[PDB]
Amino acid sequence: KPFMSLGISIMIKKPQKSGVFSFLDPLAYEIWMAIVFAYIGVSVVLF
Amino acid sequence: VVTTILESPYVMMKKNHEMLEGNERYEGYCVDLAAEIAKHCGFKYKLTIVGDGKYGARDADTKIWNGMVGELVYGKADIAIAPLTITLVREEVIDFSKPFMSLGISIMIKKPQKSKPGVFSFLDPLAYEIWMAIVFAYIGVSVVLF
Amino acid sequence: PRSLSARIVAGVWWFFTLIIISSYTANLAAFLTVERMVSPIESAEDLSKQTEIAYGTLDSGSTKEFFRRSKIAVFDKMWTYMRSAEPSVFVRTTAEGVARVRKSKGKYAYLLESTMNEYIEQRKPCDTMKVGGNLDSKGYGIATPKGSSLGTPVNLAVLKLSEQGVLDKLKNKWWYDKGECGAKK
Amino acid sequence: AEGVARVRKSKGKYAYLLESTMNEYIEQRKPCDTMKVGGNLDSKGYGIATPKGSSLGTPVNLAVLKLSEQGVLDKLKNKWWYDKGECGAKTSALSLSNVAGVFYILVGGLGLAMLVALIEFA
Amino acid sequence: PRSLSARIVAGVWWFFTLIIISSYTANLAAFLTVERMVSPIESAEDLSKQTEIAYGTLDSGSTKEFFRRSKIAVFDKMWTYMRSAEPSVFVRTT
Amino acid sequence: LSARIVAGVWWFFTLIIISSYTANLAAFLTVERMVSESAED
Ligand SMILES: C=C(C)[C@H]1CN[C@H](C(=O)O)[C@H]1CC(=O)O
Ligand SMILES: C=C(C)[C@H]1CN[C@H](C(=O)O)[C@H]1CC(=O)O
C-alpha cells in the first residue's frame, strides 16, 4: 500500500521580487528624465 | 455478489427506481465503477445494499464483524465496492486493492460573513507601521521647516 | 514670502503624501476587487486551542477511530476534547452532521473525509466549505475476502482504470460536473 | 538535477514535468527560484516492492499501513523535506518599504535643504 | 495664516476628504474591474446548476425536445432540473 | 496671460501624471492580491 501519495506536476521558474527606488519604479526612472526635464523646462520658461 | 451502501454520490436510488429492477435501479460513482471492473474481469454481477447498513467494524466483546467487511469475511458477499476506507484493522481480515480514490480527513465549516471593518480596517491600506512612520515623518518635516 | 528650502521640502513632502495616497487607493481598490477574507479556522490547531467553536466526527467510522488511535499532540488533544464534550458532539449520519453545521449557526464544525466534504460543498444552498489541507493521506479501495480469486483481477483493474484517467473523469462526473457551485450589487 | 538545472539555466524558457514529491523538495532548495504550479495531473503513489509470492510481502504491507496510521510517515517527510528547507521559513498584503524609501529620500531633502540654508546664511 | 486651531482643522479635513476620494476612486475602479469579466454562459451551464434563478423553455416545441433527447452532460442536467422543478418552469407561448 | 496658461497646462500635466501613477499602482496591488490554474496551458 502507498507509503507516500503523489502525482505528476509542473515545475516552473518564478523570479524573486525585491525602497525609494521601488516607489520610483512605477515612474519607471523616466519621470526623472521626462517630468524633470519638463520641470526645469517650465521653470526656465517662467524664468 | 457485489455489496455496497447507499451514500451520495457513490450509490443513489434513481427517481424512477420503483418501476426498475436489477442493477438498473441504482446509480452513482460506485455503479459505473462496478460496471467497469466487471467488464474488465468479464463476469455478471448483482448489486446488493449491505444489510445492517454499516461499514466494517469488529465489536470488542463479541468479536463479530458487521457491515460489508463482515459480509465478506462471513461469505455473505463476494466483493465490496463502496467508499470504504483502507485501514489496518480492515486489511487484516480482508484484502484491499490499490486505492481508486485518494482522500484525507478535512474540516467542513460554514462560510463566515465578513465582520464590519470599523476604525482599524480602513487603516489597513496604510499600515499601522506606516501610520507610525508617516507620523514620524510628519513631525520630522515640521521640525525642519521649524 | 517664498523660501526655496521650505519650497523644496514642501515639494518632496507633497510627492511623499502623493505616493502614500496613491498606495492607499491602490490597496483599497485591491481589497474591494478581490475581497479575500481571512479563514475563521485555518490551521487544524485552531480547533484544539479554542473551546468556543465545537468540532466533531461521526459516531462510527475510520475518522473517529483515527482520533481514537492517535498519538499526535493536536489530534490527541482534539480527541480528548471530543470524548469529554457535552452535549453530544458526535453524529449518526453525514447528512445529520451537515444539517448540524447549517443549523448550528456556525457553532459546529464537522470533521469529515475530503470526498464527501467536496461533494456537499457542491450542494445547495452552498453555505458550507472545506478549510485547510487534509489531516492525513488515505484512500478508498475495492475489498475482497482473504484469498479470493477476484483479488488479482480487481487489483489490476483499478490500476488500469486509474492510469487511463477514467477514475478522474468519473469523479468529475459525479462531483464537479453536476455540481451546483462550480469554479468556486 | 538535469531538469532542474535546465529550468534554472533556461531563463524561464523551460518547464520541467516531474513527480510532485521531488518538486516539493526542490522548491525548498537554494537559489530558490523554482516552484510547483497547479494541481497534480494524476494520483499515484510509492510502494515497497517484493518478489511475487515472497514471504516478506504481507508483513511489510501491514507494516506500511501500521506506520501510516500512527503518522510516522508524515513526520518523516516533514523531517526530510520541510525541516531543513533553506528557502521556506510575516505574510501580509502591505509592506511599508515600498512607501518607506521616500522617508529616506525625504531625509536626504531635509539634510540637503538644511545644509544649503546653512551655507546661505554663512 | 498660521492659526493653529483652524490649521489642524484644515489638515484633518484634508486627510478626511483625501481618504474619502481615495475610497471612491478605489471602489469605482473595482466596480469597473468587475463589470467586464466573463458572464456565465458555459458557466450559465454551471448557472443552470445553480438553483436560485429559475430557467425554462416552451411547454412544447423543438427546444424542449432538444433538452429531452439530449445526451450532453449539461443539457441533460438542465432537463433533469426542469422536468422536476417546483413550481413549473415551462411556458405556453413566447 | 502667458505664465498663467503655462502654470495651468502644467497643472493638468502633473495631474494626468499622478493619475496615471495612481491607476498603475492600483493595477499593481490588485495584481498582488490576484494569483498567477489549469495544467493544460
Ligand atoms: C460514511 C461513512 C459512515 C463511512 C464512509 N467512509 C468512512 C469509513 O470508511 O470509515 C466513513 C466516514 C467516516 O468515518 O467519517
Ligand atoms: C415559435 C415557436 C413556438 C416554434 C417555432 N419553432 C419551434 C418548433 O419548431 O417547435 C418552436 C419554438 C421552440 O420550440 O423553441
Curated annotation (Swiss-Prot), chain C:
Phosphoserine: residues bearing it: S70, S104
Induction: Down-regulated in the pyramidal cell layer of CA1 in the hippocampus by global ischemia.
Localisation per UniProt entry: Cell membrane; Postsynaptic cell membrane; Postsynaptic density membrane
Swiss-Prot/TrEMBL site (Interaction with the cone snail toxin Con-ikot-ikot) positions: R68, K160
Annotated site (Crucial to convey clamshell closure to channel opening): I41
Segments on the Extracellular face: 25-185
Tissues and organs where the protein is expressed, per its UniProt entry: Detected in forebrain. Detected in dendrites of neuronal cells. Expressed in the pyramidal cell layers of CA1 and CA3 and in the granule cell layer of the dentate gyrus.
Superkingdom of origin: Eukaryota
TM stretches of this protein: 4-24
Family: Belongs to the glutamate-gated ion channel (TC 1.A.10.1) family. GRIA2 subfamily.
Protein's job: Ionotropic glutamate receptor that functions as a ligand-gated cation channel, gated by L-glutamate and glutamatergic agonists such as alpha-amino-3-hydroxy-5-methyl-4-isoxazolepropionic acid (AMPA), quisqualic acid, and kainic acid. L-glutamate acts as an excitatory neurotransmitter at many synapses in the central nervous system and plays an important role in fast excitatory synaptic transmission.
Subunit relationships: Homotetramer or heterotetramer of pore-forming glutamate receptor subunits. Tetramers may be formed by the dimerization of dimers. May interact with MPP4. Forms a ternary complex with GRIP1 and CSPG4. Interacts with ATAD1 in an ATP-dependent manner. ATAD1-catalyzed ATP hydrolysis disrupts binding to ATAD1 and to GRIP1 and leads to AMPAR complex disassembly. Interacts with GRIP2. Interacts with GRIP1. Interacts with NSF via its C-terminus. Interacts with CACNG2, PICK1 and GRIP2. Interacts with GRIA1 and SYNDIG1. Part of a complex containing GRIA2, NSF and NAPA and/or NAPB.
Protein name, as recorded: Glutamate receptor 2
Organism: Rattus norvegicus (Rat)
Residues of the full protein shown: 614 to 804 of 883
Swiss-Prot record, chain F:
Protein modification: Palmitoylated. Depalmitoylated upon L-glutamate stimulation.
Residue ranges of the TM segments: 1-21
Domain comment as written in the entry: The M4 transmembrane segment mediates tetramerization and is required for cell surface expression.
Other facts: The postsynaptic actions of L-glutamate are mediated by a variety of receptors that are named according to their selective agonists. This receptor binds AMPA (quisqualate) > L-glutamate > kainate.
Family from the record: Belongs to the glutamate-gated ion channel (TC 1.A.10.1) family. GRIA2 subfamily.
Function noted in UniProt: Ionotropic glutamate receptor that functions as a ligand-gated cation channel, gated by L-glutamate and glutamatergic agonists such as alpha-amino-3-hydroxy-5-methyl-4-isoxazolepropionic acid (AMPA), quisqualic acid, and kainic acid. L-glutamate acts as an excitatory neurotransmitter at many synapses in the central nervous system and plays an important role in fast excitatory synaptic transmission.
The protein's name: Glutamate receptor 2
Species annotation: Rattus norvegicus
UniProt gene name: Gria2
